[PDB]
Amino acid sequence: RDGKLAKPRQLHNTLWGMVCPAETPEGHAVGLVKNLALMAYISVGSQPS
Amino acid sequence: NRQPTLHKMSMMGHRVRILPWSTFRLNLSVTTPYNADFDGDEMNLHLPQSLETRAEIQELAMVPRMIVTPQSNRPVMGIVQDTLTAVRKFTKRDVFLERGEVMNLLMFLSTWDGKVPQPAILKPRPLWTGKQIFSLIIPGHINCIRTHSTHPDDEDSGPYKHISPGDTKVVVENGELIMGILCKKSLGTSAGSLVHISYLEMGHDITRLFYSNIQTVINNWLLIEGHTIGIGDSIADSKTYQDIQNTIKKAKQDVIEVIEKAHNNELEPTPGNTLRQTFENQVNRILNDARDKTGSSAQKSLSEYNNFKSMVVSGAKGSKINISQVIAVVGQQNVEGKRIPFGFKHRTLPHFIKDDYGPESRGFVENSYLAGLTPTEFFFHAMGGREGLIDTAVKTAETG
Amino acid sequence: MIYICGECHTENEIKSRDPIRCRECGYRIMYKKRTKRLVVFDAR
């Protein structure tokens, strides 16, 4: 929560449509917690049989 | 004092005055030293208990004794956000006041001797001027020569050097405003200003009255003159829009010729430059010099009644690029000091085709904040804002 | 004093140092009855 490395904090191209681009807190936790978009759906899993 | 104490101006000695409700109340020209603003801020006060400590706080660290700073030998308190815009309009060449309004304004001068000056226009009816009333606020007999922020540099060359059709070249001779409009270059916190000279010559107990009188008189005139900002002040005529469209089209044209002549290996690298480097350098040239003339085309179409130009010219708040960003073009975004990278593989978003190097496909936002942005431009704008938001979070801890 | 059940709202006087249960309902959440000394407000 205090590391100064920017690459885990900057906005990545692959977040299009799956994580909200504008909503994030300021302070020391910038870009570390994120909220997911409206229609984004997380999978639950199945068997490859 | 305020939350972080950086320099010795972040802790100064005030004087108590008790009021009904339950917040600390303080003047505005002192918010520059404390670096404060009134959106849920907080400040502490400590009360000297002895009498020796009271005397030393009184003769060492009272706020009128700390107007000029030893860090850069220039004042730290100047006229501020709302009084500056009004002071610029109050000292224009054409501001005439009737009798009742002059009396009402003189009622607010704390250092007035009790005499009413003779009007500048005795017939057909008596009318006072803005500079004629401002000449009563200026203390003692001081002397100063400054310039206004719109002084054409080619004015000292020809004739009218001491006439100044635009009413520039502020001249304060023997303690009275003879000519010129007042702005941040002549009343703010810079070396050689009017407040600096008044502090150097008259002392530390008269500059206090100077500040207070300026503020009270100008506010009580502003509630007659009024001030605002709308969307009529954020829109342009039909001719300017066509010009902006034309120049944008021609720039997007030139970029295409550069690209398609780089695809036939017809580019020659410059000394110390890779081929990618020279390609992107000249496309950045084309894109950057393009938005500038759109900015100038937006500027030269503004009006004298515009309210953006009224806060930019007086130096109260804003810059000359926000005008062009609101009216003409947002410009070109970039992360890490370079163009928008290929976050996907050979793409920026799944809406483009691979290895597209055009302007719109790598961050050039060609709309204005009034016409709104398209989704792909919204995203790139968010990226630029995010990096600009992280840097500030780092800076505070580092410097402290 | 006098308590009010949380389900059937049937008042029942509970004596000091006595288990907390309703009657006719068998319930274990009791609300104390509103006071009888009067307080005055302003329409302001």
Added chain:
Amino acid sequence: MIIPVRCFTCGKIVGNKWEAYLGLLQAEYTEGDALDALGLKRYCCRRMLLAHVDLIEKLLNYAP
């Protein structure tokens, strides 16, 4: 939760116009015409009814 008795800006009495407003929207009226049939002509008094959410009808579902 319940319609205010007075417009916040003018002071005109609004609290007696909520049932008549629902009654006009009931038949066929548009919101623009129902507000004119009641005599609300300043746009500060029309905001009162046009943007009101009636939460009192959902707190009457919990048994006392």
Added chain:
Amino acid sequence: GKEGRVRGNLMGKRVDFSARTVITPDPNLSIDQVGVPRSIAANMTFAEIVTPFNIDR
């Protein structure tokens, strides 16, 4: 060290006779004045020695 007895209570310590609250603007005050509510002013004190010049007051 910090928060021990050498770096947490020798030079940096909590003090009395102090208050804290929000700030709001006031253009009617001189640049050397501050406005204090009546609940803070009726709490902090100042010891004043008695001399035959200020006995009655």
Added chain:
Amino acid sequence: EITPDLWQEACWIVISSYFDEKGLVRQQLDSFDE
């Protein structure tokens, strides 16, 4: 049979079908039942 320029009211009628069934916290409720 095609949808020409009636699109602005058509896209908001499939999105209504999505939220009427799924909801907003199906994220949490489905990993627990598993």
Added chain:
Amino acid sequence: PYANQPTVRITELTDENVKFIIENTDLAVANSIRRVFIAEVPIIAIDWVQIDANSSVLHDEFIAHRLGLIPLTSDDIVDKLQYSRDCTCEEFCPECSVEFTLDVRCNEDQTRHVTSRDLISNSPRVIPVTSDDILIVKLRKGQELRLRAYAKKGFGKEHAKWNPTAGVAFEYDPDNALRHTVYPKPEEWPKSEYSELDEDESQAPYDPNGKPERFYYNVESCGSLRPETIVLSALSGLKKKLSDLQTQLSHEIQSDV
């Protein structure tokens, strides 16, 4: 060095608004009586509530607040009532108060609206404005409400429940004959209701030796006082302020010796 001869002329008259015109006066006087229609006209309103049993949905201080903003008929008996701080009685007496009473209980299953038809008073001169009905609260089967309230006298500087008027329009100089306001593009502005210009003009020609006259008013009413006794009680109230200040003044420069 003396006063003027203003002349009034009424245009409309209803039971809820008056339109008139005051010619030949000064701007400061035409405004000082615009602030008196609002602030300093006395009126009756509830100012003391005591609740005996409230089992409704809204808490006690919600209902005590929706009661004070109910307008009571203050037509004629406002001049006979003392201020409760001046009267020589105890906390309350029928010389400086009016007592109300509400008591409602819901027994049927269908919901019940507690309107203002339930405020029952003792003096038949001051009743809520019913001669629809303002809603106070809704009750469910098994809930009740009962209270007692007194209604004092005051004006609009105390609290905004004592002012007798809705919006008070006011304007002068319908065309910029004086250029008090400066239009950047005088063509985009709608023409005023009181204007006398042609359909293809924007402003009257500027005249420098002018002065504002012929002010236009429009005073509405909330329901307590008639719209024509709001004005008569304002002029008779402003006159009595200056007339009392002249007493204190002559009492000062007389005790100067």
Added chain:
Amino acid sequence: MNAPPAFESFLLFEGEKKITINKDTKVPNACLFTINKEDHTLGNIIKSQLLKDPQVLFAGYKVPHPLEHKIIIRVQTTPDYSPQEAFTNAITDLISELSLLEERFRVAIKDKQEGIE
């Protein structure tokens, strides 16, 4: 309770006096009245009347703080006139103006008891 009650804005206390005179010592024939528990409603009505007197050189008023209730009025007259004279002559001219306008109004409302048209 850190908020003042509403009646403090117009109701006089026991020790206070509504009006107070002081003579200005910087210029001759100047005075400075300090009305207490008052505001712009009364302050502005006076100043406009004094300017209509051809024997008054100065006239103005200010509310020194919007959160306290007190105004100040300054007057200066020609050497053959008194500030206390010009002040009281102004008031009796307002009263002669309001009482006149009330008569002309009460006539206009009963000018349409049934209606003129």
Added chain:
Amino acid sequence: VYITNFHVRMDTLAHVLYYPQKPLVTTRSMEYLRFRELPAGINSIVAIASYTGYNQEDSVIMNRSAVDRGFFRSVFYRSYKEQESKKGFDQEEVFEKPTRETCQGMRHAIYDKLDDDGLIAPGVRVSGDDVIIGKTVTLPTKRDCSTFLRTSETGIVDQVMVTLNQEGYKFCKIRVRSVRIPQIGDKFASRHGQKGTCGIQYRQEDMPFTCEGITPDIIINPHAIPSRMTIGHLIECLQGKVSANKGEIGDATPFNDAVNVQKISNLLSDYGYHLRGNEVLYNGFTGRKITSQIFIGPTYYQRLKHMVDDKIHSRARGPIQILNRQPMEG
């Protein structure tokens, strides 16, 4: 309003607005997250002008005689727990009314509000430093404890509950109700990132009015716009003025491309207004016209949680610690 059954839940620190309203300019993706059935805000009439200097540097002037009609009024609940416990044979606790001569460790505060049980009946007006729960510990006679309020509450006891926790330890919960009227420290914010405190409150007889008597509820500084460029704030107050006059509710979906400014302005000049929102305001103190025209219209403001009644505190020779004799809290 955060949930419909807020009457049952004895949460700690619950805020509730009196009169919530739904927006007049809505996005189409708010019907799916229930923002028109549990809204948080009120449509206020905002004017962007410099009036008397009390709204400089992110502040707002607000109408005082609109606060008196319910504007942005709210309530504030808070709960307290107490649990009687047998941590020892003689060290047993019990709810009872401590008497002066038997118990010993009490303060001199009043114990008359307590009932025989040791709890306060709902309805009384409990002020700062007023004991609410009387709990006595038996000494190996009777050494009493108790719970006192914090300072400066001035609440009213809402309701008292008595029951048994996870195990067999009797415990009670008490909720205190307190009403909060907006005053000149409170924090207000728009829907576009413009927070700001309240600077001063003027009555209706002092605010500037239009040519038909419409005074603004809030006045904000024009300098807040040009530096941060929130032009979405200047269109929803233009769009909002058309929605109140026509009777619809506007649409502000982001990427619509069917709602220009030229299409909103041409809709506004049909109802007899200037086609950019500007209006001619009169000064409230002197009745004179204002030389400029002021941009006025309805917008949707929210009331943030940071109030000033909670952030003021002072110390002057207070209690000190025991080991190091350094100033301590209480």
